[PDB]
Amino acid sequence: LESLHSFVAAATKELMWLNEKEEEEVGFDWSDRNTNMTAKKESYSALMRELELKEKKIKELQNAGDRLLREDHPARPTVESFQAALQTQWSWMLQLCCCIEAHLKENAAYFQFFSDVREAEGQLQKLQEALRRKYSCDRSATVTRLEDLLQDAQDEKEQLNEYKGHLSGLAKRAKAVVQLKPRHPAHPMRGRLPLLAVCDYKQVEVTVHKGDECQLVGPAQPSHWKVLSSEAAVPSVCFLVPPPNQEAQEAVTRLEAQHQALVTLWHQLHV
Numbered sequence: 692l693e694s695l696h697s698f699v700a701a702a703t704k705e706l707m708w709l710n711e712k713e714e715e716e717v718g719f720d721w722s723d724r725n726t727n728m729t730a731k732k733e734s735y736s737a738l739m740r741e742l743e744l745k746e747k748k749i750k751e752l753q754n755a756g757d758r759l760l761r762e763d764h765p766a767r768p769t770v771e772s773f774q775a776a777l778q779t780q781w782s783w784m785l786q787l788c789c790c791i792e793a794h795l796k797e798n799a800a801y802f803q804f805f806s807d808v809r810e811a812e813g814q815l816q817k818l819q820e821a822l823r824r825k826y827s828c829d830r831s832a833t834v835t836r837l838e839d840l841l842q843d844a845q846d847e848k849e850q851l852n853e854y855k856g857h858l859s860g861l862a863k864r865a866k867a868v869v870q871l872k873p874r875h876p877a878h879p880m881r882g883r884l885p886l887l888a889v890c891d892y893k894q895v896e897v898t899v900h901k902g903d904e905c906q907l908v909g910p911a912q913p914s915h916w917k918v919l920s921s922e923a924a925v926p927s928v929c930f931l932v933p934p935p936n937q938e939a940q941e942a943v944t945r946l947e948a949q950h951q952a953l954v955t956l957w958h959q960l961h962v
C-alpha cells in the first residue's frame with residue numbers, strides 16, 4: 692500500500708544521498724598533489740552540519756519501517772533489507788568521517804612542516820650570502836672597516852646557536868610526519884608499506900579496526916588497496932601511511948649539515 696511505497700521511496704532517497712557522499716569521500720585525493728586543505732576543511736564541516744540534520748530523518752525512517760513490520764507484509768523481507776541498508780550505510784558514513792578527521796590533521800601538519808623547512812633553508816641561504824659578502828667584497832674603504840668594528844660578532848654567534856635549537860625542534864617534528872607521496876597511484880613501490888587504520892572497516896573477507904596496523908600490498912581497483920592485516924582490498928581512505936617519512940627526516944638532516952658548515956665558516960672568519 693501507499694504506506695509501504697512512501698517508506699521505500701523515502702529510504703531510496705536517503706540511500707542515494709549516502710551513496711553519493713561515500714563515492715565523494717572514498718575517491719578523494721588525500722595525497723601529496725592535493726594542497727587545498729582549507730577547502731576540504733570547510734567542505735567537511737559543511738557535510739557535518741548536513742549529517743546532524745540527516746540523523747533525524749533516518750531515525751524517523753527506521754521507525755516508519757518498524758511500524759510496517761508490526762503487520763506482517765509479503766514485503767517484510769525487502770523492508771528489513773532497506774532498514775539494514777540504512778543502518779549500515781549510515782554508520783559507514785560516520786566511519787568515513789573519522790578518516791577525514793585524521794587526514795585533515797596529519798596532512799595539514801605535513802604541509803606546514805615542509806613549509807617551515809623551506810622557510811628555514813631560506814634563512815640559511817641569507818646567512819651564507821651575508822658571509823660570502825664578508826669574505827668576497829672590498830673591505831678597503833674606511834666606511835667598511837668602521838662598519839666591521841661596529842658589528843657584534845658575539846651577537847651573530849648567539850643567533851647561530853638559537854638557530855641550532857630551532858633545527859633540533861624541526862628534527863623532532865619530522866619523526867612524526869606521515870607519508871603523503873606514497874598514496875598516489877603514480878608512485879613506484881620498492882617494497883611493502885606500513886599502514887595505520889584510522890577507522891572501522893567491516894566485510895566478509897576482512898575486518899579492520901581503528902588503530903589496526905596493516906601492510907600495503909598493492910593498487911586494486913581505483914581508490915582501493917590490496918593490503919595485509921588476512922589479505923584483502925580496502926578503500927585507501929581507511930589508512931594512514933605512518934612515519935617514518937624519510938624525505939622529511941633527511942630534509943632536516945640536510946639543514947643541520949648546511950648550518951654546521953655555515954657555523955664553521957663564521958668561526959673561520961672571526962677567529
Ligand SMILES: [Ca+2]
Binds near residue numbers: 839840841
Ligand atoms: Ca666586528
